[PDB]
C-alpha cells in the first residue's frame, strides 16, 4: 500500500506501508525521507489524530489516502 | 542603540543581527493607505523597516475611517496617505515615514522611475488596469512587487520577483550530514581510535553505529543494510552488545532508520547546478550564482560527488570530552571543505574579471553550511499570467475539479474586475443593486471564461456571494492579509526564508488558503 | 453619534443575506446596533494575540469588550504589541491596552481586568457571549477550558444549548501558529487534543552537573545549581529572569563553566533564552492568527457565515501553508465527557500507582493532583500536594491498597489539579 503524508509546509511525500504497519512506523518512514524526529510528529487523518500505537488499518488508510502533519502552539 | 537590541529581541532570534540590518536599511513603498495597506505597513514598521513611503491620491472617507486603525474621524476629508502616515509614524520612532499625495496612475504617467528608489513595492486595492501597468513598469526595472487585494472574505496576494535566490532557507527539519555512508579521513581515524570492548553509555551514539557497522561490513563483504529486513537485523546486531541496560546503545538502535543514508545531493541543489545561470557565468552573474558554481566545481574536485560538509552534529547522550572532540572532527572538515569552495570562488571570479575578494568570507561560511538548503524562486511576470496565449489553463482547470477550490475565488475576482472595467463600478456596492448585478456579474464571468477558453463549472453560489460583498474591505480579512503579506516582504528584504511562488488565495469564509502558479 | 459610513464594511454581512450564510441568519438593519450594544466578549491575554484581537473586534462591530491579563509592559514586547509605547513600560498591559483602544476607536468600551484568570470564578464567565484566547502557556488553556466546561448544565442527559459559551483560542510561535474554535460540550475541548503539543525538552541532571556538551548546559548549570549554592545577590533572593544584572552574572559564570569543558556558543542572547525559555515572536504571525480568531468570533455572534470547524495550522517559513481540519472529540475525555472515566485497576493496586496514572498518562497529564473518595459519608482526603501541611499528614497513604483504604468496586473518586477548576471524576474498576 502507498500513502501520501502532507508535511507541515504543504510538501507532499509518498510512502510505502502495507496495512498492518503501526502508525509508529509511518513516522519512521517520514523521518527517513524528511529528517523530522518522530517524537514531534503529530499525524492527522480525517480529524482523527492517529494514535502511534494503533495501525494504519485501524484508521482505514487506503492507498490514495493522505496524512497531514500538524502542530499545536504554546505562545500567544 | 543597545536599547534597540532590547526592543527587537524576540525577532533577532529569528533573522539575527544581519537580518535586522537588511531590514533597517530597506525602504518600502505602500500604494494605498486602505485598511489592507495600513495593516501591512504596521507589521513592517514595528520590526524596524528602515523607512517607508505612502503613495495615495484619495481622500479619507467615512468608511475609510471606520475600518482603519490608523485613520481617525478627524482624518475624514484629508489625504488618506498623509493621514495614515501620521499614526503609523507613532508605532516606532526609529522608522522614517514619507508620503506622496499623488495617484499611482498619476505617477506611472509622469515620473515613471520614481519607484526605482524602493527595495520592494507593495500595492493594495488596485483596479486591474493600474496593476497591469505598474506590474509592467516595475518588472522592466528589476523591482520586486507585491500585489495585495481584499475583497469580501477573499484574500488575494500576488508576488512578482523575476528571480529571488536564497542561501539561508531556514528549513524546519532535515537529515543530518553525519557521513557514515561516506566517512572522510579525519572521521575514520577517529572511529578507529576507540574500542567496542575496552564508556559503555558515554560513547557518542555515532561512534557506536560506526564500529558496529564497520563490523557488519566484514561479515558480508562490505555491504550497507538497504532492505528493511536487512536494517532490522543490523538493529539486533547492536542489541547484542549492551553488556547487561544502556540508553545510548538503545538509542543508536533508532538512529539506524536514518544514520545509514544521509549523503545525497538533493534535487533542488541539482537543478540549481544544472541551471543555465550556473553553467554560463559572466560579469553580470550575481554573486549568488558564482557561489553556486563554486559549489558545483567543488562537488567535482575536492568534493567528490558531494557538497561541502555541514560541520554540525546533533545531541547524542555521551561524554563531555568524547562529544566535543567528535565535534571538531566535523567543525574541521567544514572549515577545510569551505576553504576549498573558497578557492573555486577565487578562480571563478578571475575568469570573469572581478576583484578576488568581491565575496566576503562570512558569505562563504554561511553558504557552505547552507549549501544543501539553497532555493531559487522565479515568478512568472504578471503580463504572462494575463496573456491569452500564456495563461496557465492546466493549473486553473485541474484545481476546478473541486467546485470549492480557492481558484474559483481567483476566477471570480477576474470577473469582478471585468465587471468593474465595464460598469465603472463594482458589483453590488449599494444595497438595492445587489439584485440586478447578480445577473450582470454572471455574464461577465462567462465572458471572461470565454476570452480564455476555460471550460469549467463555477457554482452560481459564488456569483451571489461576491455581490453580497459589495467590494467591502472587512478589517479582519485585511488584517490577515496584512500579516501574511508583511512577512513575505521581510523575506524579500532579508533574503532569509522562502517566498510563496505565485498567488496566494484566502477564503476567510471557510478559513482555508491555497497557493497557485498562475 | 457615529459618522456617515462608519460601518459599511461590516453592514454588508448583516444587512444582506447570501448562499454561505448560517441557517440561523436573518438579514436585519437592526442587527449591527444590537451587536454594539449587547454583545459581551472577553479577550484573554493582552500581549500580541490579545493586542491584535482587540483592534480586530473593535473595528468589527464589538463595543462591549473586557480584557484580562496579569502582566506588565516590558520593553521586549514593543516589537509586536503595538498598543504599548516605551513610555508605557512598567504599566499593566490590560490597563494600557484598554486605554489605547478606548481612545483610538471612538466609542469602543473595553474594560481592563488586571487579574490572573484563576482570580475569577464561574459567576464571572457566564457574563460573556464569547471568550477569545491569546494565552502563553498550556496550563492556562487547560484551566480556562475546564472553567467553560463547568458552566454547562445538562437537563437530564440533554445539554442545554444556551449554557455553551463558545471558546476561540489562538496559538503562536515563530512563523508557525494555529487558530481554533471550541463549543464546550459539542466540539473538541482543549483536553480532547492535549497530545498535539510538542514534547518537553528537559536536560537530564547528569549531563548538566557533569557532562556539559552544548552551550546551554553551561547556562542551565549556572542557573539551576550554581545560583542557589552561591546566592550571588544575597541569600534567599531568587534570580529575576528580567534582571539585566542577574542574567549578566549567569552569563559571566556560564562563560567560565564552559571553558572548563571547552565549549563555544555562550552568548548573552542565548543566556536570556535558556534562563527564561524564550519563544521567538513577530508582529506578522500574531496578526495572522488573531485575524482568524477575530473573524470567527464575528461569525459566532452574527451568523453571517459558518464557524470554522475545529482546527487551523499556519506556517510561514516556506511560502504560506494552512491546513484546516476537524479535531475528533474524544468521547472519553476527562474534561468534556458526560460521566466519570471508568479506570481499570486490579485490587492489588498500591496507591502511589494512581498518583502516577494521572500524573504521567499522556491522555491527561496532571501537574500535582489530589485524590479523595468517600468512606463513611466522611470524605477521605487520601493524598494531596496543594497544602504543604496536609501533604505530610497524608503522604503515607501512597502505600495502602484500594480496599486497604475502604475502596469498594463501582464507586467513584475525585481529582482536582492546578490545571483545572472543575472536579474530574473516575468510576473505579477492579478486574
Ligand atoms: Zn474533552
Curated annotation (Swiss-Prot), chain A:
PROSITE patterns: UBIQUITIN_1, UBIQUITIN_2. The keyword Nucleus applies. One of its GO terms (biological process) is anatomical structure morphogenesis. InterPro entries: Nedd8-like, Ubiquitin-like_dom, Ubiquitin-like_domsf, Ubiquitin_CS, Ubiquitin_dom, Ubiquitin_ubiquitin-like. It holds the Pfam family ubiquitin. Cleavage of precursor form by UCHL3 or SENP8 is necessary for function. (Microbial infection) Deamidated at Gln-40 by bacterial cyclomodulin Cif produced by enteropathogenic E.coli, Y.pseudotuberculosis or B.pseudomallei, leading to impair NEDD8 ability to activate cullin-RING-based E3 ubiquitin-protein ligase complexes (CRL complexes). Deamidation occurs on NEDD8-modified cullins. NEDD8 deamidation prevents switching from the inactive to active state by maintaining the 'closed' structure of the CRL complexes. Deamidation may also impair its deconjugation by the COP9 signalosome; However this result needs additional evidences. There is a cross-link at residue 76 (Glycyl lysine isopeptide (Gly-Lys) (interchain with K-? in acceptor proteins)). The record marks 8, 44 as: Interaction with UBE1C. Ubiquitin-like protein which plays an important role in cell cycle control and embryogenesis via its conjugation to a limited number of cellular proteins, such as cullins or p53/TP53. Attachment of NEDD8 to cullins is critical for the recruitment of E2 to the cullin-RING-based E3 ubiquitin-protein ligase complex, thus facilitating polyubiquitination and proteasomal degradation of cyclins and other regulatory proteins. Attachment of NEDD8 to p53/TP53 inhibits p53/TP53 transcriptional activity. Interacts with AHR; interaction is direct. Interacts with NUB1; interaction is direct. Interacts with ESR1. Belongs to the ubiquitin family. This is Ubiquitin-like protein NEDD8. The lineage of its organism: Eukaryota, Metazoa, Chordata, Craniata, Vertebrata.
Swiss-Prot record, chain B:
GO terms for cellular component: cytoplasm; cytosol; glutamatergic synapse; plasma membrane; protein-containing complex. Keywords: Acetylation, Apoptosis, Cell cycle, Cell membrane, Disease variant, Intellectual disability, Membrane, Ubl conjugation, Ubl conjugation pathway. Residues 315-328 are annotated as: Interaction with UBA3. Ubiquitous in fetal tissues. Expressed throughout the adult brain. It is found in: Cell membrane. Ubiquitinated by TRIP12, leading to its degradation by the proteasome. The record marks 202 as: Interaction with UBA3. CDD domains: APPBP1_RUB. The modification N6-acetyllysine is found at residues 1, 325. It holds the Pfam family ThiF. Pathway: Protein modification; protein neddylation. NAE1 and UBA3 correspond to the N-terminal and the C-terminal part of yeast UBA3. In yeast the two subunits form a single polypeptide chain. It is linked to Neurodevelopmental disorder with dysmorphic facies and ischiopubic hypoplasia: An autosomal recessive disorder characterized by moderate to severe global developmental delay, facial dysmorphism, and ischiopubic synchondrosis hypoplasia. Affected individuals show infection-triggered lymphopenia, and loss of developmental milestones associated with epileptic spasms. Diminished white matter volume, enlarged ventricles, and thin corpus callosum are visible on brain imaging. Heterodimer of UBA3 and NAE1. The complex binds NEDD8 and UBE2M. Binds APP and TP53BP2. This is NEDD8-activating enzyme E1 regulatory subunit. It comes from Homo sapiens.
UniProtKB/Swiss-Prot annotation, chain C:
Changing residue 186 to A: Reduces affinity for UBE2M. Changing residue 387 to A: Impairs NEDD8 transfer to UBE2M. Residues 22-39, 126-130, 161-186, 300-307 are annotated as: Interaction with UBE2M N-terminus. Changing residue 337 to P: Impairs NEDD8 transfer to UBE2M. ATP binds at residues 69-93, 117-140. Keywords: Acetylation, ATP-binding, Cell cycle, Ligase, Nucleotide-binding, Ubl conjugation pathway. Residues 337-431 are annotated as: Interaction with UBE2M core domain. Changing residue 393 to A: No effect on NEDD8 transfer to UBE2M. The active site is at residue 206. CDD domains: Uba3_RUB. Changing residue 339 to P: Impairs NEDD8 transfer to UBE2M. Changing residue 300 to A: Reduces affinity for UBE2M. The record marks 180 as: Determines specificity for NEDD8. Ubiquitously expressed. Residues 196-198, 321-326 are annotated as: Interaction with NEDD8. Changing residue 180 to Q: Abolishes specificity for NEDD8. The keyword Acetylation applies. Heterodimer of UBA3 and NAE1. Interacts with NEDD8, UBE2F and UBE2M. Binds ESR1 and ESR2 with bound steroid ligand. Interacts with TBATA. Arg-180 acts as a selectivity gate, preventing misactivation of ubiquitin by this NEDD8-specific E1 complex. Belongs to the ubiquitin-activating E1 family. UBA3 subfamily. This is NEDD8-activating enzyme E1 catalytic subunit. The gene is UBA3.
